[PDB]
Amino acid sequence: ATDYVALGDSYSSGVGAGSYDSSSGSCKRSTKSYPALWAASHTGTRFNFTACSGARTGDVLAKQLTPVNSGTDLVSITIGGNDAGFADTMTTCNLQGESACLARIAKARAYIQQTLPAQLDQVYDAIDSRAPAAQVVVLGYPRFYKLGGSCAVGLSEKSRAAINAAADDINAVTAKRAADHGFAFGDVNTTFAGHELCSGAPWLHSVTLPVENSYHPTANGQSKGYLPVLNSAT
């Protein structure tokens, strides 16, 4: 292949997919994450994996862009969820009930729609400058829930739908920002459809243990949800 930098948050590092690289520390970079799977299946990949659990756009700027340079051939990224406080939102939703959940989501969605686009530009501008020849793939987040059926979970239908809408919002904002820098956008709903929570075939962890894994892709989610989307953009 060649010089692949994989940036982003826990959906890119692979929190929830297991088999973590011990040196990544709290970044929780999984060898079963889509970037690690990509590198392991493309011969000769110089794989710079800087994605990190908990990362915001600011963390990408401060800690992750170091190996991004004129030599970079491929950049992947998921980022923006933590900026919008998704982890915090999910936690609140599963503890404080529907009203608090809906309020927290609304606040997150306001962030996504209003505040996030410029922060994405911050990151994408950096990629523009440092790695002008790199093919850049921005991957979205999956809608977390399949709606319409009975589902054995604590979040109400309303809460599920609201969280889905947040995903829809962030994916819309991100696809347009990505395209605005000439980056590819990888919509992971193309693969996660039929594999949301409540789908009967989840490729996401529900609210689970260890706590950090909740709402993140399973190993199957990384290998067949995220990775095929990266591969589709090559």
UniProtKB/Swiss-Prot annotation:
Induction: Expressed once the cells enter stationary phase, with a maximum at the late stationary phase. Keywords: Disulfide bond, Hydrolase, Lipid degradation, Lipid metabolism, Secreted, Serine esterase, Signal. GO terms for cellular component: extracellular region. It is found in: Secreted. This is Lipase. The lineage of its organism: Bacteria, Bacillati, Actinomycetota, Actinomycetes, Kitasatosporales. Optimum pH is 9.5. Disulfide bonds join 27-52, 93-101, 151-198. Inhibited by 3,4-dichloroisocoumarin and tetrahydrolipstatin in the absence of substrate, but by phenylmethylsulfonyl fluoride (PMSF) only in the presence of substrate. Several water-miscible solvents enhance the lipase hydrolytic activity in vitro. Tetrahydrofuran and N,N-dimethylformamide (both 50%) inactivate the enzyme with t1/2 of 5 minutes and t1/2 of 2 hours, respectively. Belongs to the 'GDSL' lipolytic enzyme family. Catalyzes the hydrolysis of p-nitrophenyl esters, alpha- and beta-naphthyl esters, and triacylglycerols, with a preference for medium acyl chain length (C8-C12). Shows a much higher hydrolysis rate of glycerol esters of unsaturated C16 and C18 fatty acids than that of their saturated counterparts, and a preference for cis double bond. Is also able to hydrolyze several natural oils and Tween detergents. Also displays thioesterase and phospholipase activities, towards palmitoyl-coenzyme A and diheptanoyl glycerophosphocholine, respectively. The active site is at 10 (nucleophile), 216.
